[PDB]
CSV table of all heavy atoms in Angstrom, one decimal:
chain,number,residue,atom,x,y,z
A,50,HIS,N,99.9,107.1,123.2
A,50,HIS,CA,99.3,108.2,124.0
A,50,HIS,C,100.2,108.7,125.0
A,50,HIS,O,100.8,109.8,125.1
A,50,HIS,CB,97.9,108.0,124.5
A,50,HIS,CG,97.4,109.1,125.2
A,50,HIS,ND1,96.5,110.0,124.5
A,50,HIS,CD2,97.3,109.5,126.5
A,50,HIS,CE1,96.1,110.9,125.4
A,50,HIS,NE2,96.8,110.7,126.7
A,51,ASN,N,100.5,107.7,126.0
A,51,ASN,CA,101.3,107.9,127.2
A,51,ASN,C,102.7,108.5,126.7
A,51,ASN,O,103.1,109.5,127.3
A,51,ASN,CB,101.6,106.6,128.0
A,51,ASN,CG,100.3,106.0,128.5
A,51,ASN,OD1,99.3,106.7,128.6
A,51,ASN,ND2,100.3,104.7,128.8
A,52,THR,N,103.4,107.8,125.9
A,52,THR,CA,104.7,108.2,125.5
A,52,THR,C,104.9,108.5,124.0
A,52,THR,O,105.2,107.4,123.1
A,52,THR,CB,105.8,107.1,126.0
A,52,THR,OG1,106.9,107.0,125.0
A,52,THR,CG2,105.1,105.7,126.0
A,53,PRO,N,104.8,109.7,123.6
A,53,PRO,CA,104.9,110.1,122.1
A,53,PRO,C,106.3,110.2,121.7
A,53,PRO,O,106.6,110.1,120.5
A,53,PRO,CB,104.2,111.5,122.2
A,53,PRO,CG,104.5,112.0,123.6
A,53,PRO,CD,104.3,110.7,124.5
A,54,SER,N,107.3,110.2,122.7
A,54,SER,CA,108.7,110.0,122.5
A,54,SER,C,108.9,108.7,121.5
A,54,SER,O,108.4,107.6,121.9
A,54,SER,CB,109.5,109.9,123.7
A,54,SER,OG,109.3,108.6,124.3
A,55,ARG,N,109.5,108.9,120.4
A,55,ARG,CA,110.0,107.7,119.7
A,55,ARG,C,110.8,106.8,120.6
A,55,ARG,O,111.8,107.2,121.0
A,55,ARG,CB,110.6,108.0,118.3
A,55,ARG,CG,112.0,107.4,118.0
A,55,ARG,CD,112.8,108.2,117.0
A,55,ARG,NE,114.0,107.6,116.7
A,55,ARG,CZ,115.2,107.6,117.4
A,55,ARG,NH1,115.1,108.1,118.5
A,55,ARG,NH2,116.3,106.9,117.0
A,56,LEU,N,110.5,105.6,120.7
A,56,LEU,CA,111.2,104.7,121.7
A,56,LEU,C,112.6,104.4,121.2
A,56,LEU,O,112.8,104.1,119.9
A,56,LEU,CB,110.3,103.4,122.0
A,56,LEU,CG,110.8,102.3,122.9
A,56,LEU,CD1,110.7,102.9,124.3
A,56,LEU,CD2,110.1,101.0,122.7
A,57,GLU,N,113.5,104.5,122.0
A,57,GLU,CA,114.9,104.1,121.7
A,57,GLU,C,115.3,102.9,122.8
A,57,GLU,O,115.0,103.1,124.0
A,57,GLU,CB,116.0,105.3,122.1
A,57,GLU,CG,117.3,104.9,121.6
A,57,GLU,CD,117.4,104.9,120.0
A,57,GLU,OE1,116.5,105.2,119.4
A,57,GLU,OE2,118.5,104.6,119.6
A,58,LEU,N,115.8,102.0,122.2
A,58,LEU,CA,116.3,100.9,123.1
A,58,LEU,C,117.6,100.3,122.7
A,58,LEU,O,117.8,99.9,121.6
A,58,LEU,CB,115.2,99.9,123.2
A,58,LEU,CG,114.2,100.0,124.3
A,58,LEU,CD1,113.1,99.1,124.3
A,58,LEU,CD2,114.9,100.0,125.7
A,59,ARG,N,118.4,100.0,123.6
A,59,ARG,CA,119.6,99.2,123.3
A,59,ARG,C,119.2,97.7,123.3
A,59,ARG,O,118.7,97.3,124.4
A,59,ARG,CB,120.7,99.5,124.4
A,59,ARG,CG,122.0,100.0,123.9
A,59,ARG,CD,123.0,100.3,125.1
A,59,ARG,NE,124.3,100.6,124.7
A,59,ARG,CZ,125.3,99.8,124.7
A,59,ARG,NH1,125.1,98.5,125.3
A,59,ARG,NH2,126.5,100.2,124.3
A,60,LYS,N,119.5,97.1,122.2
A,60,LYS,CA,119.2,95.7,122.2
A,60,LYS,C,120.1,94.9,121.3
A,60,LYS,O,120.8,95.5,120.6
A,60,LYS,CB,117.7,95.5,121.6
A,60,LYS,CG,116.8,95.3,122.8
A,60,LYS,CD,115.4,95.0,122.3
A,60,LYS,CE,114.6,94.5,123.4
A,60,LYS,NZ,115.2,93.4,124.0
A,61,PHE,N,120.3,93.6,121.6
A,61,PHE,CA,121.2,92.8,120.8
A,61,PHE,C,121.0,92.7,119.3
A,61,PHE,O,119.9,92.4,118.9
A,61,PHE,CB,121.1,91.3,121.4
A,61,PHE,CG,122.2,90.3,120.8
A,61,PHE,CD1,123.6,90.4,121.3
A,61,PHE,CD2,121.9,89.7,119.8
A,61,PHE,CE1,124.5,89.6,120.6
A,61,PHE,CE2,122.7,88.8,119.1
A,61,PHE,CZ,124.0,88.7,119.7
A,62,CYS,N,122.0,92.8,118.5
A,62,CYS,CA,121.9,92.6,117.2
A,62,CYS,C,122.8,91.3,116.5
A,62,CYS,O,124.0,91.5,116.8
A,62,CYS,CB,122.4,93.8,116.4
A,62,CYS,SG,122.1,93.7,114.6
A,63,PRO,N,122.0,90.4,116.1
A,63,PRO,CA,122.7,89.1,115.6
A,63,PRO,C,123.8,89.4,114.6
A,63,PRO,O,124.6,88.4,114.4
A,63,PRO,CB,121.5,88.4,115.2
A,63,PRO,CG,120.4,88.9,115.9
A,63,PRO,CD,120.6,90.3,116.0
A,64,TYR,N,123.8,90.4,113.9
A,64,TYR,CA,124.7,90.7,112.8
A,64,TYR,C,125.9,91.3,113.3
A,64,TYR,O,127.0,90.9,113.2
A,64,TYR,CB,123.9,91.4,111.7
A,64,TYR,CG,122.6,90.8,111.4
A,64,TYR,CD1,121.3,91.0,112.1
A,64,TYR,CD2,122.6,89.7,110.6
A,64,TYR,CE1,120.2,90.4,111.8
A,64,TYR,CE2,121.5,89.0,110.3
A,64,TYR,CZ,120.2,89.3,110.9
A,64,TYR,OH,119.1,88.6,110.7
A,65,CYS,N,125.6,92.6,113.8
A,65,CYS,CA,126.7,93.5,114.4
A,65,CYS,C,127.4,92.7,115.6
A,65,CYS,O,128.5,93.1,116.0
A,65,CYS,CB,126.2,94.8,114.8
A,65,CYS,SG,125.2,95.7,113.5
A,66,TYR,N,126.8,91.8,116.2
A,66,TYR,CA,127.1,91.0,117.4
A,66,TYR,C,127.3,91.7,118.7
A,66,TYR,O,127.6,91.0,119.6
A,66,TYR,CB,128.4,90.3,117.1
A,66,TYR,CG,128.3,88.9,116.5
A,66,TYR,CD1,128.3,88.7,115.1
A,66,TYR,CD2,128.3,87.8,117.2
A,66,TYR,CE1,128.2,87.4,114.5
A,66,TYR,CE2,128.2,86.6,116.8
A,66,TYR,CZ,128.2,86.4,115.4
A,66,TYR,OH,127.9,85.0,114.9
A,67,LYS,N,127.0,93.0,118.7
A,67,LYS,CA,127.2,93.8,119.8
A,67,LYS,C,125.8,94.3,120.2
A,67,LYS,O,125.0,94.3,119.3
A,67,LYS,CB,128.2,95.0,119.6
A,67,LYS,CG,127.9,95.6,118.1
A,67,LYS,CD,128.7,97.0,118.0
A,67,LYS,CE,128.0,97.7,116.9
A,67,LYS,NZ,128.6,99.1,116.7
A,68,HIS,N,125.7,94.9,121.4
A,68,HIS,CA,124.4,95.4,121.8
A,68,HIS,C,124.4,96.8,121.1
A,68,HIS,O,125.2,97.6,121.6
A,68,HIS,CB,124.3,95.5,123.3
A,68,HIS,CG,123.4,94.3,123.9
A,68,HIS,ND1,124.2,93.2,124.2
A,68,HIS,CD2,122.3,93.9,124.2
A,68,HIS,CE1,123.4,92.3,124.6
A,68,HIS,NE2,122.2,92.7,124.7
A,69,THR,N,123.4,96.9,120.2
A,69,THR,CA,123.4,98.2,119.5
A,69,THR,C,122.3,98.9,120.0
A,69,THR,O,121.6,98.7,121.0
A,69,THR,CB,123.3,97.8,118.0
A,69,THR,OG1,123.9,96.6,117.6
A,69,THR,CG2,123.9,99.0,117.2
A,70,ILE,N,122.0,100.1,119.3
A,70,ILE,CA,120.9,101.0,119.6
A,70,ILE,C,119.8,100.7,118.5
A,70,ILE,O,120.2,100.8,117.3
A,70,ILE,CB,121.2,102.3,120.0
A,70,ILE,CG1,120.6,102.8,121.2
A,70,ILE,CG2,121.1,103.2,118.7
A,70,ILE,CD1,121.4,103.7,122.1
A,71,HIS,N,118.6,100.5,118.9
A,71,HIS,CA,117.4,100.2,118.0
A,71,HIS,C,116.5,101.4,118.1
A,71,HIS,O,116.0,101.5,119.2
A,71,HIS,CB,116.8,98.9,118.2
A,71,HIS,CG,117.7,97.7,118.0
A,71,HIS,ND1,117.7,96.8,116.9
A,71,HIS,CD2,118.6,97.1,118.8
A,71,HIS,CE1,118.4,95.9,117.0
A,71,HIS,NE2,119.0,96.0,118.1
A,72,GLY,N,116.2,102.1,117.1
A,72,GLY,CA,115.2,103.1,117.2
A,72,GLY,C,113.9,102.6,116.6
A,72,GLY,O,113.6,101.4,116.5
A,73,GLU,N,113.0,103.6,116.1
A,73,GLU,CA,111.8,103.1,115.6
A,73,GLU,C,111.6,103.5,114.0
A,73,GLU,O,112.5,103.9,113.4
A,73,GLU,CB,110.7,103.7,116.3
A,73,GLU,CG,110.3,102.9,117.5
A,73,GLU,CD,108.9,103.3,118.0
A,73,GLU,OE1,107.9,103.3,117.1
A,73,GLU,OE2,108.7,103.5,119.2
A,74,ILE,N,110.5,103.0,113.5
A,74,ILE,CA,110.1,103.1,112.1
A,74,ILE,C,108.7,103.7,111.9
A,74,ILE,O,107.8,103.3,112.8
A,74,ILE,CB,110.2,101.8,111.2
A,74,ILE,CG1,111.5,101.0,111.7
A,74,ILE,CG2,110.2,102.1,109.8
A,74,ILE,CD1,111.4,99.6,111.1
A,75,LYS,N,108.5,104.4,111.0
A,75,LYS,CA,107.1,105.1,110.7
A,75,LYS,C,106.4,104.0,109.8
A,75,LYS,O,106.6,102.8,109.6
A,75,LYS,CB,107.3,106.4,110.0
A,75,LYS,CG,107.9,107.5,111.0
A,75,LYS,CD,107.7,108.9,110.5
A,75,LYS,CE,108.0,109.9,111.6
A,75,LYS,NZ,107.8,111.3,111.1
């Protein structure tokens, strides 16, 4: 409700090894 914006977050990825950007899924 508060935030209808699909959340975007920079977070660590064990595979790519770099802090990547993680979006959302429906």
Side-chain angles (χ1 to χ4, degrees):
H50 182 92
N51 299 341
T52 149
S54 71
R55 134 198 183 279
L56 185 68
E57 188 73 2
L58 264 176
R59 237 176 174 255
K60 266 185 163 307
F61 178 88
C62 183
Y64 306 96
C65 311
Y66 266 92
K67 45 166 196 175
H68 270 81
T69 327
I70 227 146
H71 299 257
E73 272 201 48
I74 319 171
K75 295 194 167 183

